[PDB]
Amino acid sequence: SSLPVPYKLPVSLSVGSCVIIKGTPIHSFINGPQLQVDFYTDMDEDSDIAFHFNVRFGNHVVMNRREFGIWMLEETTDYVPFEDGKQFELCIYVHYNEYEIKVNGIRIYGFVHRIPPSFVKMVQVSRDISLTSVCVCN
Amino acid sequence: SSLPVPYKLPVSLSVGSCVIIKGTPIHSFINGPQLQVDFYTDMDEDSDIAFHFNVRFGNHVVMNRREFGIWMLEETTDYVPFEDGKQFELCIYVHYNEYEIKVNGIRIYGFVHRIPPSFVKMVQVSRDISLTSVCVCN
Ligand SMILES: OC[C@H]1O[C@@H](O[C@H]2[C@H](O)[C@@H](O)[C@H](O)O[C@@H]2CO)[C@H](O)[C@@H](O)[C@H]1O
Ligand SMILES: OC[C@H]1O[C@@H](O[C@H]2[C@H](O)[C@@H](O)[C@H](O)O[C@@H]2CO)[C@H](O)[C@@H](O)[C@H]1O
């Protein structure tokens, strides 16, 4: 891996920001690897989470937020167009109303803001991947 | 312009970070356009500057830092491989000892750190350009 995992990146996000994560699962899909991305409101990992994204590769995605320390109503999709063994590109685009999530150029979900994305101060990329690059673009 | 100018971007920089700025001068070179990039230590524009970069297109580049509110010893180079009228790509790579400055893929300078780049909290892109994108990569 080019970057350490878990990777904690201090960020400032605004409408129009894009978070681009490139990496490779470290296990084949029959071994149940996961990839997790958390949009934290502080560097402290017990702070609130505006957007939590966990992919069980070959299975499904779970998304949520944590508000006042409490996990809210979980959202899911079974659309996980990742390829076994290959590098992926995960793009999270900050729109005025939602985070748009794209996997290898394919839009899979739009997670609507329940707090403004300007409250996000750290992005954590974790679990069973090797990281090639993380970019934040405007 | 896709982004407002002056563009003030809150950033966190570490060794291995790359700041990629894409834009176009808004005047032809005979009209003396400039492009300026400041690596500020705070959002306040009177805070100290770890790295100041000002290109007089078709002319030369001036670089400096501002410490305790005082401009230090100015550095210059006449290597300014920008093209009149065209989009440029300006890459600033944070190495352990220096910022490496590339213009359209060409390394033109290495400005050595006099404070650690982790002290940079805002990047300001200013003067006579239209901005297409600013990316911070690791
Ligand atoms: O919702 C994401 C969030 O939930 C926790 O796991 C849930 C689990 O998804 C649910 O099926 C079960 O009923 O309650 C669990 C709460 O412990 C995770 O622990 C957390 O990491 C998040 O992934
Ligand atoms: O060194 C960059 C810094 O200097 C100021 O301009 C200098 C100028 O470059 C120098 O030739 C003259 O002798 O002193 C000036 C100080 O006022 C700029 O004002 C500042 O914006 C920076 O560009």
Residue numbers in the entry:
A (entry chain A), B (entry chain A): 2 to 139
Paper text:
Galectin (Gal) is a lectin that binds to β-galactosides. Because the primary and tertiary structures of Gal-13 are highly conserved among all galectins, it had been named galectin-13. However, our crystallographic and biochemical experiments (solid phase experiment, hemagglutination assay, and biolayer interferometry) proved that wild-type Gal-13 could not bind lactose or a rhamnogalacturonan Ι domain (RG-I-4) from Ginseng Pectin. Primary structure alignment showed that a highly conserved histidine residue was modified to arginine (Arg53) in the ligand binding site of wild-type Gal-13, which may be why Gal-13 could not bind lactose.
